[PDB]
Amino acid sequence: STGSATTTPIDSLDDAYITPVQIGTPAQTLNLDFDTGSSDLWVFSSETTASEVDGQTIYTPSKSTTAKLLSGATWSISYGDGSSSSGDVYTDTVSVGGLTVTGQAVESAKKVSSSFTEDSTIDGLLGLAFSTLNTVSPTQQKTFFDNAKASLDSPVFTADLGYHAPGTYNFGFIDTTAYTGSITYTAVSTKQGFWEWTSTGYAVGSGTFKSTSIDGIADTGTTLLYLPATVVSAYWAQVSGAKSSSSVGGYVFPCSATLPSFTFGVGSARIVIPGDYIDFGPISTGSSSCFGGIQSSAGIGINIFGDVALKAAFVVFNGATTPTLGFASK
């Protein structure tokens, strides 16, 4: 089997992307944030504290003939950005782009933090990291991909995120028309539960590529590119007027600037992020100062190849017995 679904930016900055997901019988369609950096499929629901719901579409398990309550099970997650959510657990039929998993754990939120409430466009998350990170207790549950894997034509999914435009998540096949050149594959460590890999280096604009190992995670659920302070300083030093602002929370630059590209290595291959992808707009409405899309990972504890990096590539998440990642230009 296969599936194919369009993913759409939530706003004009590509802050996140939402993908329609069918849950239950009859289908209830919710728009979920596909997150390769976490492993819980959780939704706003009829159980979510009413005051914490503000415009989201909710899952109502009592209206689904296929919903089952997982007796006594609970879940609770905290994300790197400080957001959180928690609740109880159902299993139900879940379909993405024509691909159906029966008995998928659908984690129903009783509580969500303010950042989720405040974002009316995101009805929940669909985790695509390794199931070892799933937070269900007492017994951890499997991700949508882990459940679908054995049925897929090939044990893979691909992320093809757009810049200021829709893109595509495919399950079970590689669309050979969706990228230019060849896909370069690279090793993955699953030891921390992430799609963790080692980039072979970077370049800033037209500068000569520096060969150096950069360990990080491929994370569709993180907006920006977070890299070591050395690398990030080298990038912003090439932007007139750029500086790190502790009050703003990162590197800012004059909105009138022409940003250089940023290149990262995948083996001997190279992915070039155009300068425009690194512009995240005025720091506040009407400001001439803009927020940068490449920021330091110091204090995160891990480097994160988030949407800024991933949307410059066609990315293969290969869930074979020994997982790998593939990257192609597009």
UniProtKB/Swiss-Prot annotation:
Broadest EC class assigned to this enzyme: hydrolase
Chain ranges of the Peptidase A1 domain: 17-328
MF (Gene Ontology): aspartic-type endopeptidase activity
Disulfide bond positions: C255-C290
Active site: D35, S199
A biological process term (GO) from this entry: proteolysis
EC number annotated for this UniProt entry: 3.4.23.22
Alphabetically ordered keywords of this record: Aspartyl protease, Disulfide bond, Hydrolase, Protease, Signal, Zymogen
Enzymatic reactions: Hydrolysis of proteins with specificity similar to that of pepsin A, prefers hydrophobic residues at P1 and P1', but does not cleave 14-Ala-|-Leu-15 in the B chain of insulin or Z-Glu-Tyr. Clots milk
Family: Belongs to the peptidase A1 family.
Protein name: Endothiapepsin
Source organism of this protein record: Cryphonectria parasitica
